[PDB]
Amino acid sequence: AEAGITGTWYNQLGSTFIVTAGADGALTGTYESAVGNAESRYVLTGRYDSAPATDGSGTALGWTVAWKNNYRNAHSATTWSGQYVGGAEARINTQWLLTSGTTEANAWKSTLVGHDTFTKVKP
Amino acid sequence: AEAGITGTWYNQLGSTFIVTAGADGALTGTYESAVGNAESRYVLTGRYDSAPATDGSGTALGWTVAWKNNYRNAHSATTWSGQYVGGAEARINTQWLLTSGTTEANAWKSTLVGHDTFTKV
Amino acid sequence: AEAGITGTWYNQLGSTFIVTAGADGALTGTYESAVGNAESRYVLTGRYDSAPATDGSGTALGWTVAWKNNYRNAHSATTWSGQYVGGAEARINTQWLLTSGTTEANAWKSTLVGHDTFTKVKP
Amino acid sequence: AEAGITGTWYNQLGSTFIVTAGADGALTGTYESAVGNAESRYVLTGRYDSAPATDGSGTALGWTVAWKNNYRNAHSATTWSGQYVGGAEARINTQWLLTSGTTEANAWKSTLVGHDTFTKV
Amino acid sequence: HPQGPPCK
Amino acid sequence: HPQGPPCK
Amino acid sequence: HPQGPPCK
Amino acid sequence: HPQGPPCK
């Protein structure tokens, strides 16, 4: 449900995700790196599947962050795909892909994969 | 080239992707599935990294599509991560993650992974 | 180091992995599903990189299990890629790919991805 | 066909893979990298699922290669998961995970993912 | 699923 | 599947 | 990288 | 890395 998703979330590496879920399935916000001052904020956009999910099923969602802002340009973008699971302890469990822009020759090793779990802290 | 990402792209499965790249990193458009159909269209939103790349590199980008529209709701979402390469033959090479909303017990197999190459042909 | 890897390990879903690391970089053993009686054992084979790793770095390894034995045939195979991290609490952190045999048409959705962490229990 | 997996396979990067499929699910062989070279050969071990597949399905398999031989040690290992399809044009379509041994602080980016299609051509 | 090919 | 938890 | 933990 | 193309 949009409300449950909306809020501030953190993951085990110390990064910050601030998101607002709109009624039209949109996801917007900012993502901040693990500690490190104020200018570590990047724009994120995503989508969530507003489910009739009376199954205790999670809500599927995903979002993208291109690692470029006014202070830095890492020439890479990450996409997180996962599910939002509500309750008193809501969590968003994801798997992510981080692709860096490479030349033809290193394209083979341009993508990293991992997983992150986010815990909600504020609305 | 920069906003060479804007346009209509097709992949090997037949799906079409229509996007507009904004000068500041935004990616907006529609993703349409099988048959072309009429409302096999879903909204997509993404971001791309606008950089100098003297060393002939591709442009990193990614986008998401939640599989729900006013006619279908597949309780899932796909995210594509990859890079744009322009030239005579522009292509967007991606790897994707498709996660379905499951219950705990099925969460271990909630995600499929694959790859797709999109062209303007 | 072969010793540290050799032993019995379990992961959070309740599955059992029994492995022996040989001096030649080989990995052999059996994998058992999460609870479920005796005939839930499958053969696994893998390789580990015997590292001069005096960095507190993990040892990279991987293994494969084809889900077919004398009782069942699931027509699928899983490969786990990860690192062994020793200490009093040794762990093997992995990311896995599970591919099922499909026809040409469903090949697009033949592979699942996830992650599992194994805790060592016996030598 | 069943032991049609046995043979020499090549992928788009130039690497060669030579394997023997045992009647009971084993996969053994050598994987050689760039240039062909001499000791760009690494041992590979894997497993494949021997099944009836009336419905024209591929055969699921996977294998690992630890990147260490008596000449190099790249402190990493790759696992390929995929399926074999035989016929006039046999192919092994895979997705792979390459994990490097890192320290905790770098563990978040210890794994690369990709895909490779191997042919006997 | 709307991500695959057609069901023709 | 022999890689998931027990059944219900 | 802005997606990993802090530095040393 | 021995998994890539050659360094030619």
UniProtKB/Swiss-Prot annotation, chains A, C:
GO molecular-function terms, A-Z: biotin binding
Transmembrane feature ranges: none
Nucleus among the record's keywords?
A: no
Question: In this protein, which residues make up the domain named Avidin-like?
Answer: 1-123
Per UniProt, subcellular location reads as: Secreted
Which residue numbers does the motif Cell attachment site cover?
Answer: 47-49
Q: Does the keyword Secreted apply?
A: yes
Q: What residues does biotin bind to?
A: 31, 42, 80, 96, 108
Can you quote a single GO CC term?
Answer: extracellular region
Give UniProt keywords alphabetically: Biotin, Secreted, Signal
Tell me its family: Belongs to the avidin/streptavidin family.
How is this protein organized at the quaternary level? Answer: Homotetramer.
Q: What does this protein do?
A: The biological function of streptavidin is not known. Forms a strong non-covalent specific complex with biotin (one molecule of biotin per subunit of streptavidin).
What is the recorded name of this protein? Answer: Streptavidin
Per the UniProt record, the source organism is: Streptomyces avidinii
